[PDB]
Every structure is written in structure tokens, then in C-alpha cells.
């Protein structure tokens, strides 16, 4: 077999959207509040994350099918998946040598050290860093990566989804494009799809873990005041 | 006549509090989101202002008498007067030569040019800049300045004040300490008190003007998202 027009189209659509929402130069980082190497790295990281949410939203809008859902479902999907999509897209800048998120320069190289001073314990960072590596290893293709993100985001099983049938349809089409791609255009990728979907499962664990920690943070004004409106809104639990 | 113990005390209390809440080095500015010389100067200035609100709050807590009011009245007083107290304390860094707010370096020198790109029209900036100069000219003493701020903040005529009698008492004591000071320890200051109180009146006009403009801004998400939780909260109209 081989990918069809509609399928290649979907890939081009996604990959191009990813490009249009992922600045490989990391030039925008200078605009965030300076990283300070007691939650010293919270302001910068809060800005980095808020920035990421913005890109995630723009990426979504460009997923064929996402645009036609009810704002309620788009929001439902966003709020629920945002954090994971961010952990996913963040791997594209994760290094194995120094085991960190290198983003342009040394002042934007986040080591396990820095990442701590952001208000998050290792109960989160540990599984996250493991996810980052297990994923890095898969040495995916831009299309398998861009697809995995789209799939993840179009998961109907998120608290809030109304039309968990149309959202179910879209994702299945996406799941295929991937499954197919890994088949036709991906040599030595016989056990990949499995591992990839498996990653979506790891993300859920990380999602849950972050939610608890974040909830703990948001209840402390001296900290919540350090966040951004966008972050407070998306990560906040307002039905 | 001459100032009394209780009066000098109040001054020492205020002046020391001002010192403990006004960093003459402006070292904290490097922590704000970088100034970018379409509301380009909003992120930085929003951080500068949020930072200022924090100091204003700490200054307040140190005003003898403020600490014993009901949180509701303290909040009422803060939300209502904050903006003015900020415009007041900001003069302490206003220059006549370059007609700007110089704060440490050239990257923190806010010219009438910059100040525009913060989302505010000249209908505000104009009166503000005029206030800044008319005030600068008074060449006040640290004690007349620190006092004017305390007085301003302890104005009972603010929408929300419950006990507008105790707050009335405190301010009158403050109004005197000043009136007295300008008398005893201030040569050539015969028409000062009058002019000073007159300034409190100009502030009201600026307060009103800013409120309208800010209200306009806060209704635009693409802009409100640029603000800080603290600013949204204090400048926001939630009863």
C-alpha cells in the first residue's frame, strides 16, 4: 500500500502548521522575563510556557478539522491537552549529551538543575525527563512528530468534550496517516506506532502529575501572581 | 511652634518606610520583561507597574494606622489610590533636562515616545507629564514627598471605604505633620501646602483618565493577557 492524496495532504498541512508555530531560532526567548539561575526560574519558565500555549493554540487552529468544532470542544481539547502538547513539542529542543532543553544559547539551556527552581518537584521532573529521552530515542520524523502532536490534541477522552464522536473521527483519520506513514515511508519502523501510542499514555501520567503540582502552586498568591493570565486561564480549573 | 514627638515620629516612620520600599538603584528592572523601543512597551511597563504596586502595598503596611484598618478598607484604599501613589512615587525619577523617567540606565529611560507604546493616548500622558513637572518644580523634601504619598493613600473619599471616619482621622493627623513641617522646617514654603494639596486634586483627574483608558485595554484579551495578575486584580473592577 501507500499514502493517498488526502493523507499526504493532511501531513503537509500539519508539518507546515508546525513550522508556522515553532521558531527554530528561539529568538522570542529574549522577550521573556530573564532566567535567574525559592522558585527563581518561575517567571522565565512561566513566560516560556505561556508562549508555548500560544503556539499550541495556533498549531491547533491549523489542524484540518479542528477549526470546525464547537469553541467549547476546542477549548475542552486545549485545556486538557495543552500541557502534554507542550511537553511533546519541547522534546524538539532536548539534548542527550547535556540532558537539557537547549534553546538557542547557554542562557536558554535548561538543565535538570534549573527546571527544579520552577516550583516543580522531581516526582514530576523525573518521569518527564524519562519521557523526554524515551521519546528522543524514537528518532521520529517531522511528520511522525507533527502527527503525534495532532493526534494527542485530538484525543476525545478529555474532561469537557461534547462531541466525542467527531473528535473521535478526526483522530482516527490522523492515527491512520501516521500508522500508514510509519509503514510506507519509515524503514525499520515496525514496532514504532506501538511505542508512539505508548508515549501518549506516558503523557497522561505526566499530565496528571503536573496538574496536582500546579494546583498546589496556583493556591499560593505569592506564586500565582508570578504566572501569566493565559496560563492561569488554561491551567485553571474553571468550568 | 515646632513639630512634636508624635509628629517627628510619624515622619521618621514614613520616610524610613519609603526607603524600605524604593530602590534608588533600580536594580530590579532587569528582572522585568525587556523594554522594546502596537503597544511594544506594554510588557515591560506592565511589569514595572506591577512591581510598583507591590512596593506601594509594602509602603502602606508601614504607615502608622494603616495596619489597623479592616482589610476591606485597606484594599479599598489601595485599589482606589494605587495608581496615583505610583504616579507620585514615579516623579522621584523624573528628569527635567530630557523630560523622562530615567531609571538607572538608558535602557530604562522612558521618554514621552516610549510611554506612548504602552497602550495609553496623550489625553493621559499630557496631563501626567504636566503633573510630573509641576510637581518636580515644588522641589519637595523627602518628608514632604513621603508625607504627600501617605496622605494621598489615606484619603477617605474613595469608592469602597467603610470606616471613612478613622481613615479621616489618620489623614488629618498626616495633613498636619505636613502643614507643620512646611512651616517650621521649610524656608520659603509659605504657599507650598496649598500647592501640594492642589496636586492631590490633579491626581484625581489623572486617576479618572487612566481608569477609562485602562478599562478600554482590559476588555481586549490580546492586551489584558500582557498584564500581570496583580495589575488585573488591583486595576480590575471586582467589588
Amino acid at each position: 500500500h501507500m499514502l493517498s492524496d488526502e493523507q499526504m495532504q493532511i501531513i503537509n498541512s500539519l508539518v507546515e502548521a508546525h513550522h508556522k508555530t515553532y521558531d527554530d531560532s528561539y529568538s522570542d526567548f529574549v522577550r521573556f522575563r530573564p532566567p535567574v539561575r525559592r522558585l527563581s526560574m518561575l517567571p522565565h519558565l512561566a513566560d516560556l510556557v505561556s508562549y508555548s500555549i500560544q503556539k499550541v493554540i495556533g498549531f491547533a487552529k491549523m489542524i484540518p478539522g479542528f477549526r470546525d468544532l464547537t469553541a467549547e470542544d476546542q477549548i475542552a481539547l486545549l485545556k486538557s491537552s495543552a500541557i502534554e502538547i507542550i511537553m511533546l513539542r519541547s522534546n524538539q529542543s532536548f539534548s542527550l549529551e547535556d540532558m537539557s532543553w537547549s534553546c538557542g544559547g547557554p542562557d536558554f539551556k535548561y538543565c535538570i538543575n534549573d527546571v527544579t527552581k520552577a516550583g516543580h518537584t522531581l516526582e514530576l521532573l523525573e518521569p518527564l525527563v524519562k519521557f523526554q529521552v524515551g521519546l528522543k530515542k524514537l528518532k521520529l520524523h517531522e511528520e511522525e512528530h507533527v502527527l503525534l502532536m495532532a493526534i494527542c490534541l485530538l484525543s476525545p477522552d478529555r474532561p469537557g468534550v461534547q462531541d466525542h464522536v467527531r473528535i473521535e473521527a478526526l483522530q482516527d483519520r490522523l492515527c491512520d496517516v501516521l500508522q500508514a506513514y510509519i509503514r510506507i515511508q519509515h524503514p525499520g519502523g515496525r514496532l514504532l506506532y506501538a511505542k508512539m501510542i505508548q508515549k501518549l499514555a506516558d503523557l497522561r501520567s505526566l499530565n496528571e502529575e503536573h496538574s496536582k503540582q500546579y494546583r498546589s502552586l496556583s493556591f499560593q498568591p505569592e506564586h500565582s501572581m508570578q504566572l501569566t493570565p493565559l496560563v492561569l486561564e488554561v491551567f485553571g480549573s474553571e468550568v | 511652634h515646632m513639630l512634636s514627638d508624635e509628629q517627628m515620629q510619624i515622619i521618621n516612620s514614613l520616610v524610613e518606610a519609603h526607603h524600605k520600599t524604593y530602590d534608588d538603584s533600580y536594580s530590579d528592572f532587569v528582572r522585568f520583561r525587556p523594554p522594546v523601543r502596537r503597544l511594544s512597551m506594554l510588557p515591560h511597563l506592565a511589569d514595572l507597574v506591577s512591581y510598583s504596586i507591590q512596593k506601594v502595598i509594602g509602603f502602606a503596611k508601614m504607615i502608622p494606622g494603616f495596619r489597623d484598618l479592616t482589610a476591606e478598607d485597606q484594599i479599598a484604599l489601595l485599589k482606589s489610590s494605587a495608581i496615583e501613589i505610583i504616579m507620585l512615587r514615579s516623579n522621584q525619577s523624573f528628569s527635567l533636562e530630557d523630560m523622562s523617567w530615567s531609571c538607572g540606565g538608558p535602557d530604562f529611560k522612558y521618554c514621552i515616545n516610549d510611554v506612548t507604546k504602552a497602550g495609553h493616548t496623550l489625553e493621559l500622558l499630557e496631563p501626567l507629564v504636566k503633573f510630573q513637572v509641576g510637581l518636580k518644580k515644588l522641589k519637595l523634601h523627602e518628608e514632604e514627598h513621603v508625607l504627600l504619598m501617605a496622605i494621598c493613600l489615606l484619603s477617605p473619599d474613595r469608592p469602597g471605604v467603610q470606616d471613612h471616619v478613622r481613615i479621616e482621622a489618620l489623614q488629618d493627623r498626616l495633613c498636619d505633620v505636613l502643614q507643620a513641617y512646611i512651616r517650621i522646617q521649610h524656608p520659603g514654603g509659605r504657599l507650598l501646602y496649598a500647592k501640594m494639596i492642589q496636586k492631590l486634586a490633579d491626581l484625581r483627574s489623572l486617576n479618572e483618565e487612566h481608569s477609562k483608558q485602562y478599562r478600554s485595554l482590559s476588555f481586549q484579551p490580546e492586551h489584558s493577557m500582557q498584564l500581570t495578575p496583580l495589575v488585573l486584580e488591583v486595576f480590575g473592577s471586582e467589588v
Binding site: 493554540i57 495556533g58 477549548i75 485545556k79 493565559l230 | 481586549q220 484579551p221 490580546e222
Partner: peptide
Amino acid sequence: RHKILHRLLQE
């Protein structure tokens, strides 16, 4: 709610 998300999500 979700003032921001809405704006960002609209064309």
C-alpha cells in the same frame, strides 16, 4: 469564561 482562549481561537 476563557476570555483569552476565545480571542486566540478566533480567526
